[PDB]
Design a protein around this ligand. Sequence first.
Ligand code: MGO
Lengths: 135, 179
Amino acid sequence: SEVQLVESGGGLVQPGGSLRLSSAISGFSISSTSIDWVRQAPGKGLEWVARISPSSGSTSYADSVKGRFTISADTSKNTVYLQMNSLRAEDTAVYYTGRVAKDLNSSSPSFVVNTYSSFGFDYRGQGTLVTVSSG
Amino acid sequence: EHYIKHPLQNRWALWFFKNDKSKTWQANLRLISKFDTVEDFWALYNHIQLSSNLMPGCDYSLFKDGIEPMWEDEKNKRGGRWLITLNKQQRRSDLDRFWLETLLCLIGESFDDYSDDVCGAVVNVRAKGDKIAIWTTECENREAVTHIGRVYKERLGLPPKIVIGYQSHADTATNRFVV
Ligand SMILES: C[n+]1cn([C@@H]2O[C@H](COP(=O)(O)OP(=O)(O)OP(=O)(O)O)[C@@H](O)[C@H]2O)c2cc(N)[nH]c(=O)c21
């Protein structure tokens, strides 16, 4: 199959609200790689959010979301998910799934996003817009 | 078809040099691929031999589309290179990591406004010692050349005491800066 990463589940929520994001991935197996959620807000650098290795179930999180966000995977559906609880204005961004290039996979996701931003992902979806506002 | 790629700021071409002693230097040089997206860069890098696995005397060159990886190009003739010289042990430890870091400095425009002075990069796989170089367009442009050198050395993670040199192509064919 052609490689696709289709992120969905974004929308408008008030502070304290929750969303569950999905990324349906085709053309490579999520069982053979890590997958990162990253987010891009206006006037800010690309921000790493969370990493999952579906084969092992190993997960890591940015300090900015740890305890509120949960990254998970369904290997059979080749899909990754981001459960986002108690959303805040500062969580407003486009949320993307990316696969870091195999040749950079020994670097921390924080290092990859800080050093290479978008250039470190050999594939990345067009993402889903998440807007947290009361006014 | 459906997948939307990420355009690079510049369009690029990868060149391969095969040492054949019977042929001219120019005849041994071949353009092997053009690309202008993040995805197509990684697809190419994943579909060719690592520099460390090349036959002795072979090169890779990554240059902006329309710049040939030779001194004679209009964009190179007044220019020069930041040169990294590797010892024999460094082929296994450092060559591929340094080359990929160089490629990412190029396609990622990592020298900000000064990236406009970058023409390309060359890796020479050699028995006597491997070489990696970033080629820039004007050896007189000390502001751009000094900035590219400093940031390149930072990105490679070279110890301060490993001094790297900038040579003009005019001098090579017959150090203007160090960091
Ligand atoms: C980059 N380059 C290399 N060469 C030829 O190839 C010779 C070797 O250069 P190069 O492969 O970069 O370096 P080596 O490590 O093989 O040899 P050395 O001279 O650095 O010891 C050089 O002296 C020229 O005769 C070139 C000839 C040209 N007309 N134009 C080039 O850009 C050019």
